[model samples]
Target: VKRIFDTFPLQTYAAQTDKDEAVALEIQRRSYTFTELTVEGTYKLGVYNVFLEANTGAALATDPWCLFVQLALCQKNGLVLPTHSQTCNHEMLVLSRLSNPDEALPILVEGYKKRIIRSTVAISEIMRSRILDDAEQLMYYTLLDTVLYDCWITQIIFCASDAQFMELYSCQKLSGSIVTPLDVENSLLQKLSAKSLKISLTKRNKFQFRHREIVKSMQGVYHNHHNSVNQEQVLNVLFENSKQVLLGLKDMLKSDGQPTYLHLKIASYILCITNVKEPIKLKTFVENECKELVQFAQDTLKNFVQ
Candidate 1:
């Protein structure tokens, strides 16, 4: 048999309530001969140690074996067992039961191993054993029959659509609505223009406010307008203020960190300005300025993160 070191960190190890109780019960049951048991053969790992406590005509089970069995039951039933270093100790016993029963028998020799397997007398052990059985039943009954069948049917229908040339189409038809195609097109264009103008104006106001705040904050700190030190300070302030403005814009647009939204916003702004001429020059100026500010903010964030 190979011995492995099980190191439990002291602080966390002492707080293990179940292990402490088990140790106390085990000592009482065996007349407090645990120290002799350890001295005879068993070893300690961290605070917890495992020894061949008894050989009651069964197998000489180890601490790792108990843990492994617990882990296997947990895994078999889609459960998470307590683990050290992400590897479950309980699973070793379960694997031994399933794959190497002969090895486990030596540990349990003092007990009737075959009787333990055959008789369903032990309620707790029965519950642990039933987890694997329950998991198998659940997989075949619930998942395989319902979820798998639905997924398979959906896939089949989707694939059949491609072969049958079934093109998906959708349309909305409104009743008692006196709106012509020309009316809709004109109305949409007007709405789009209006929306673009509003966005532009909002952007302009926000940028102006932010710039003013930046200037106010930097007023006393810098004496020269174009000095390198002053320029650096000004740029830093501007960058910080720009970040806030950009964050506000992002929230307003509900972009959800998608690059596509930024592009769409820019495109819409440009289209609003370029499509119609003016007297419309006021809207155009706002749109252009806003687009520049938006672009600056987007680029700054992208570069800053990178």
Candidate 2:
């Protein structure tokens, strides 16, 4: 907090002496931007300072604080941040100011939810067609909740058709995948937020089918940090569904024609989400259905459209 005041010029150029609802300060050098907040009204100013300090010394200087501040305000106002969007800086820094997810991830999820729910990029033409529906939407959503959780090393920003709806895309990170070191300050806030009335809690629905149930399970595990028996059951359901979905996708792995986007997506996801070690039949799937997928990453997707 003290650091920002000392380092940056937070003063209004005018000597009007009258305080406004928010004050602005210069952050970047050339953009000549001003970081603003209120004097009397509740400004997420404290988090702003936290974010500014968090942003002090970085290489790319991505304004992760954009997502940070947005999520903080959302929690303050009892809203979940958007699903699909841009990107972020450090998880620790952003979490230092807010609830969870990477810079871009929060935006990505926000964008996805908004797009699926049709709020963010609400263009009816591409949007309705782009979003997954029924089986495909849920399949992609389940896979997304599974792989989207961690995305650094296995950084396969899966540009799939149905991971968008049900075309069933699969990909993401450090599959020897790892979580960034736990951010204690943010974790504490998350726990507090869990029990608090401030952020509206997500009401889980009692979904009643295999695939939708799997997604519900994935969404459950998405936000939980526990080892309940349900978590285990949910995980099994998820893999079982993944296998079933892949078997259907594998039928499309042709020796004859151009692989459809669905084919490309399925093959990509099976490799991204599952591996040979566990899930029992995983090795069988890999040996049989997923053999060609080993090189899916190397080939640039050809049918990529706007």
Candidate 3:
């Protein structure tokens, strides 16, 4: 009993297309990451790795980050992409022409070892519910969604282990001729060194809001850098300072308890922000960067989650 549009979520969409009614069509790949041998691709790689290095669990799996991977895969496979940004009013916000996803799945299955595919039924429930009524709560969920979406794409696209990534990425089928991974690797490394430097940490573009004043303080994180107006030490004093309990987030991460998984998500998202590239001993970063998250555990999540 589902309509055609029902298949696409309100927040995430792919455009519907009419195949029988033909018109000459043209499309372009505008992304900084996938343009083949561009300086921008490497900078994007660094940006993506910043998030990748910050991630926990397996590098390949997580919500919305998995969604990001799917977009890249479908891009290489010659399809119009989809996005989950509620704020960005993209033209093809929802897809209308996907009668044959079977054609697209093969390449995507090959590219990444794993991914997150959300059910429309569930995403719709969150959309339909009143739980996201609090504005600050929406800010956390939306920001978390974007961080996951941007992780580890450069790792796969710039990677050396896989030849198919290049063959498919280049969109090339040579007639018994060899194309090396070196071609793809050599092409995108110009900004490779810039990867480690802090780039757009809190100023990440995905957190788009209609009202500028709503996030004026959050965007204030950017001012710390232009420090002829030096608020150097004061920069670290700010926090999101939210107090509402985010309900049902534990189900989002697929863990048994909400707080434990929310705790895991807390650790993971801050690591994505603070530029901690190490995984084995993240506890060191936790004491301070997650000062708020730590206190959050003892007071709210501890009794509630278990």
Candidate 4:
């Protein structure tokens, strides 16, 4: 009894050519009046308002934490890229901020009463518990905390020498009068280093290995002025590690009986964002490598939106 348009959410949402005729037909047949629409009470749960940078454009998020949250929500939904801000299974506010200098960027506002979810780990942990199951969450965290943070945050963001770091900070401060948040300012990385320098009498006294190694490597490269040394080798290892996750998701799609739209969506997105040099762009990669998987995922989401 289902119609063709019912299975195609993104296409229908965009009024794209493939499903345009079917959507039009269905709408014509199932017409309703605005008077029939009335406010109705429902579950007590409320909408999530995720705030991130507008500089990256509406469809893409380049910042790591912002990108992760974006992916996490997309993992819960269908494959279609959101054309506007309301893509994260909720409302998303794109801010470029002049205030709230103390708090982090990419804050998640939730509840009807409005509470803010701050910090990278806090936001990630909430999504893991709230939305994803154990296996999915593990995969999510491994890629994010272990791989992406190591490469993007420690190696890249915090790689600069002390003088360069100050120069960068000074340049940022002098660039404009606006009070951008920590993520954009590179001040967050400085704060992270300051925190890592401390030790406690508690069990938390354990040294952060990867973080220390990153510091050592940075010292060697910058201090020694070794043009021969680079983070590419490390990046290669991380890329291989990420590739395993992609393969695992593919296997999940193949073996699992349930539709794995989230898995498929994550896979496509991971491939898109991971390796910058030879990035397998999303649509092209999925179309070439994952026809069968994508077909089923599309079909599953098609039913879901209906």
What TM-scores do the predictions have?
Answer: 0.14, 0.31, 0.27, 0.42
lDDT of the candidates, in the order given: 0.29, 0.30, 0.29, 0.38
Better of 1 and 4 by lDDT: 4
Task: Write candidate 2's Cα lDDT for 1-306 as tens digits.
Answer: 987668686555766766543322221111111112122222211111111111112111112223223333333333322211112211211112133221111121122222222111222122224345556655554453343222201111111111211111111111222344545443343333332211111111112232243234433324454534554565555556655554554444453444433343343344333322233444355556766654452231222111
Any runs in candidate 4 off by more than 4 Å, and if so which?
Answer: 1-58, 63-68, 71-90, 96-105, 111-115, 130-145, 148-209, 215-232, 255-265, 271-306
Output the number of the lDDT-best candidate: 4
- Clashes per prediction? 27, 30, 12, 1
> Per-residue lDDT tens digits of candidate 4, residues 178-254?
36774445655444443222111000111146545434554432444352244445555654665455455565555
Tens-place lDDT digits, model 1, residues 105-180: 1121112223223211132243344435555433333322233222222222222232111111101111234478
Ranking under TM-score, best-scoring first? 4, 2, 3, 1
- Give me the overall lDDT of model 3: 0.29
For 99-192, candidate 3 gives per-residue lDDT tens digits of 1232111111111223333333233233324335666546654544443323322222222123322222222222243267765545443233
For candidate 4, the C-alpha RMSD (Å) to the true structure equals: 17.7
Between candidates 1 and 3, name the one with more favorable TM-score: 3
Report how far residue 41 has shifted in candidate 1, in Å.
Answer: 99
